[PDB]
């Protein structure tokens, strides 16, 4: 895999996806089996370069704060699915660095995994 | 223009750097006039591709609890310096998403 901590598993379009929690990602990313793709695209700047990628169609995403509809960037070049600031804002997540690891906590203090 | 939240300003080599706090980064990154470089490099995989970048020599970094010595990747293709999981562990940081933004605090909720 799995991605390193901090990580979280969410149901996305009926399937579990384990994400790296990525506060440096403006938008969230699926890497494999993204489901149906839109023909809308975006220019994505990464740390090492940039490229054009397509958006998925809408997915239901089961956040601890309640299910919402979300579209993901499909980035098959990316090493892990990424949960970015778009969904972290909806989750009102806290990310705590403790030991050599990191734990995600919800806005009610409940541990998320 | 600062990087987006969550962000933090730390002294590196004696002068402040405003980083994007990036839990997706394995190691911390400088982007511009990084100072002396090592002869060593790393392969860096980003969201869109990979290539090699040079390590800095050691830098004095002023954290909350005191100075550490740390090396950074110099990645001039990256739009912002990144404070990654390497230094977030050393800071024992917490990152809180509240309202539309995000704040970074210490292990017991003090600002940095």
């Amino acid at each position: 895999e799995p991605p390193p901590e901090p990580r979280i598993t969410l149901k996305v379009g009926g399937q579990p996806v384990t994400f790296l929690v990525d506060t440096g990602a403006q938008h969230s990313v699926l890497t494999q089996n993204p489901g149906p793709l839109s023909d809308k695209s975006a220019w994505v700047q990464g740390a090492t370069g940039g490229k054009r990628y397509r958006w998925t169609t809408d997915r239901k995403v089961h956040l601890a704060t309640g299910k919402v509809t979300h579209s993901f960037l499909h980035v098959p070049d990316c090493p892990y699915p990424l949960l970015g600031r778009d969904l972290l804002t909806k989750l009102k997540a806290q990310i705590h660095f403790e030991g050599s690891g990191a734990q995600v906590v919800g806005p009610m203090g409940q541990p998320l995994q | 223009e600062p990087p987006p939240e969550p962000r933090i300003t730390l002294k590196v080599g004696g002068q402040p750097v405003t980083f994007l706090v990036d839990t997706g980064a394995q190691h911390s990154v400088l982007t511009q006039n990084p100072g002396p470089l090592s002869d060593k490099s790393a392969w860096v995989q980003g969201a869109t591709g990979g290539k090699r970048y040079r390590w800095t020599t050691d830098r004095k970094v002023h954290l909350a609890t005191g100075k550490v010595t740390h090396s950074f990747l110099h990645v001039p293709d990256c739009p912002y310096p990144l404070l990654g999981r390497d230094l977030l562990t050393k800071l024992k940081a917490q990152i809180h998403f509240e309202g539309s933004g995000a704040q970074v605090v210490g292990p017991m909720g003090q600002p940095l």
């Binding site: 990464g46 740390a47 990424l82 | -």
Partner: peptide, 4 residues
Amino acid sequence: XVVX
């Protein structure tokens, strides 16, 4: 990382 990812910026549009």
